Amino acid sequence: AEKLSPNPPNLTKKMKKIVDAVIKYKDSSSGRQLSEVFIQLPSRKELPEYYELIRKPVDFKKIKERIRNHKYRSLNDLEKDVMLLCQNAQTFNLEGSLIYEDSIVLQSVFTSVRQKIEKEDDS
Numbered sequence: 001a002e003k004l005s006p007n008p009p010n011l012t013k014k015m016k017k018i019v020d021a022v023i024k025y026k027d028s029s030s031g032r033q034l035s036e037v038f039i040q041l042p043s044r045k046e047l048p049e050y051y052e053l054i055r056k057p058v059d060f061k062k063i064k065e066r067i068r069n070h071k072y073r074s075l076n077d078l079e080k081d082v083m084l085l086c087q088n089a090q091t092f093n094l095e096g097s098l099i100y101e102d103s104i105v106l107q108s109v110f111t112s113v114r115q116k117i118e119k120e121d122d123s
């Protein structure tokens with residue numbers, strides 16, 4: 001595939017900062033790193049069923065590659081992919097499950113982290 005045009009540096013920096021904070025997030029009481037199940041998808045071969053139900057699979061490793069390769073052209077584009085990761089979790093897993101509910105929390109963490117980074121960049 002053709003190399004894409006680099007984003008402006010501050011935009012890439014904010015993308016990387018947002019995703020790093022979402023990844024690093026830990027439940028305040030328990031210390032559990034909610035992102036840990038979302039770093040790396042299972043194989044189409046350990047879990048072929050995942051790929052039958054989920055049209056556009058994505059994990060945090062893929063999101064990080066899509067930042068590096070400039071596939072996202074705005075924070076909106078990054079947000080869409082994080083929220084797609086979480087939607088996919090919600091599609092595949094049962095309401096009430098650890099994976100489903102953790103994805104809902106990470107949606108809120110993404111929003112909060114983005115908001116802090118945006119507010120503190122407005123100078």
Ligand SMILES: Nc1nnc(-c2ccccc2O)cc1-c1ccccc1
Nearest residue numbers: 037038040041042058059088089099
């Ligand atoms: N049940 C799951 N639901 N979702 C993901 C998942 C992982 C990364 C990104 C999005 C996901 O939706 C993984 C499992 C999973 C993990 C290990 C063995 C089997 C399934």
